[PDB]
Amino acid sequence: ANAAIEPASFVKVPMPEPPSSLQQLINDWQLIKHREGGYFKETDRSPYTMEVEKPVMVTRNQSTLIYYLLTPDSPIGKFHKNINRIIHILQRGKGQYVLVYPDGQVKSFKVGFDYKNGEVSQWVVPGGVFKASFLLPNEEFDNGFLISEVVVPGFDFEDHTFLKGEDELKHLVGPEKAAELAFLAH
Amino acid sequence: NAAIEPASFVKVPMPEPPSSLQQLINDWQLIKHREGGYFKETDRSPYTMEVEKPVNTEMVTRNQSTLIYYLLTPDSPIGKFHKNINRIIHILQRGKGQYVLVYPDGQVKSFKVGFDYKNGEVSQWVVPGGVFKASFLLPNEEFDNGFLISEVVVPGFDFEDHTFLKGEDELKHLVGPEKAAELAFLAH
Ligand SMILES: Nc1nc2[nH]cnc2c(=O)[nH]1
Numbered sequence: 442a443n444a445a446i447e448p449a450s451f452v453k454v455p456m457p458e459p460p461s462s463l464q465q466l467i468n469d470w471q472l473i474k475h476r477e478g479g480y481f482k483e484t485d486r487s488p489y490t491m492e493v494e495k496p497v498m499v500t501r502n503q504s505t506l507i508y509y510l511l512t513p514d515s516p517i518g519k520f521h522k523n524i525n526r527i528i529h530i531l532q533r534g535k536g537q538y539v540l541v542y543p544d545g546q547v548k549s550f551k552v553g554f555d556y557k558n559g560e561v562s563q564w565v566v567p568g569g570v571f572k573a574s575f576l577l578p579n580e581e582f583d584n585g586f587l588i589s590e591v592v593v594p595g596f597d598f599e600d601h602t603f604l605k606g607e608d609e610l611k612h613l614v615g616p617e618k619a620a621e622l623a624f625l626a627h
Numbered sequence: 628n629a630a631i632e633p634a635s636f637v638k639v640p641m642p643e644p645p646s647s648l649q650q651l652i653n654d655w656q657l658i659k660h661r662e663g664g665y666f667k668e669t670d671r672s673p674y675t676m677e678v679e680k681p682v683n684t685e686m687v688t689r690n691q692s693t694l695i696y697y698l699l700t701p702d703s704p705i706g707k708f709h710k711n712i713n714r715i716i717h718i719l720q721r722g723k724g725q726y727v728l729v730y731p732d733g734q735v736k737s738f739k740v741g742f743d744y745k746n747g748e749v750s751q752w753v754v755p756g757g758v759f760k761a762s763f764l765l766p767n768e769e770f771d772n773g774f775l776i777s778e779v780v781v782p783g784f785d786f787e788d789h790t791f792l793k794g795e796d797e798l799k800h801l802v803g804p805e806k807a808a809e810l811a812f813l814a815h
């Protein structure tokens with residue numbers, strides 16, 4: 442279900458520190474800051490490999506799994522895309538995703554366990570589609586947003602592409618839309 | 628390694644699920660699985676891959692991945708022993724539960740699933756291929772005694788790669804005859 446893009450106060454202006462409960466989670470699990478924002482850790486990378494044809498044959502692990510957490514101090518996952526589709530599974534909290542297709546269409550939906558209100562707890566972002574995400578205030582998980590992501594073939598930086606500023610965003614969605622989504626781009 | 632201490636509704640399931648879970652089941656179209664529990668395949672990758680499988684082996688085509696929601700309830704609190712050639716990624720979403728893994732070696736491992744990682748619980752777990760796995764519901768008022776997870780199989784799930792255990796008979800041959808008596812409620 443479509444969702445209005447109405448970033449909360451701490452999303453537009455990140456807080457210097459996250460609630461102690463989330464900091465503890467970060468420390469105990471040894472999560473590290475992701476280049477696109479948020480905290481993460483690869484917890485699984487298949488022992489099995491596969492060969493795939495890539496536009497310029499390469500080898501990749503069959504799959505990779507990560508924990509990905511957004512917090513009040515790092516509430517945004519900046520726009521980026523992967524050649525491969527990515528499976529997302531909600532575990533704790535609430536968040537919102539914004540997708541920008543190559544043709545320019547923008548889609549946004551909310552993630553949470555209240556499906557009766559349009560929220561989803563499983564979602565796949567097709568390869569080639571730019572995605573960004575931001576934290577939604579929620580009391581159930583101390584204003585945090587924890588999910589698991591699985592990519593097949595397994596993650597490789599060579600298949601990753603981050604969006605470059607509002608300039609590149611402008612080419613895709615136009616000036617007005619680019620301005621509205623600027624807070625989600627590098 | 629948690630101890631196998633089944634709740635009352637596990638050894639003797641309730642006739643029907645509680646209203647909150649029945650509503651979830653109906654809204655999501657979850658169907659009772661043969662091995663027990665309710666499930667639904669929500670994604671099967673349109674992309675494929677060729678993999679070698681023993682039969683002497685031969686090449687077969689598989690979808691790159693499959694995803695399902697899997698739910699245990701008081702009326703169906705057990706996910707009976709079954710195995711797959713492929714490893715399976717499990718992601719906890721709601722509730723609590725416990726797994727029992729029987730490796731081909733005969734080794735038995737058991738652990739609890741939940742978000743209290745401070746108490747040994749885990750919210751992500753990968754079961755290697757060839758390992759028989761079973762799960763049972765753990766009481767928890769948080770999710771009205773439900774246990775919801777997501778499972779991702781890579782390569783994607785295919786019946787040709789699936790194997791369910793047949794009663795204590797085969798179970799007894801894998802683990803001690805005495806152990807088969809303790810895990811008997813998770814098989815057949
Ligand atoms: N799996 C994985 N490893 C990474 N290392 C750096 N960035 C990433 C990422 O997005 N995924």
Ligand SMILES: Nc1nc2[nH]cnc2c(=O)[nH]1
Binds near residue numbers: 668693694695784
């Ligand atoms: N992924 C998946 N799809 C199925 N289709 C029928 N049964 C199953 C099953 O157990 N898993």
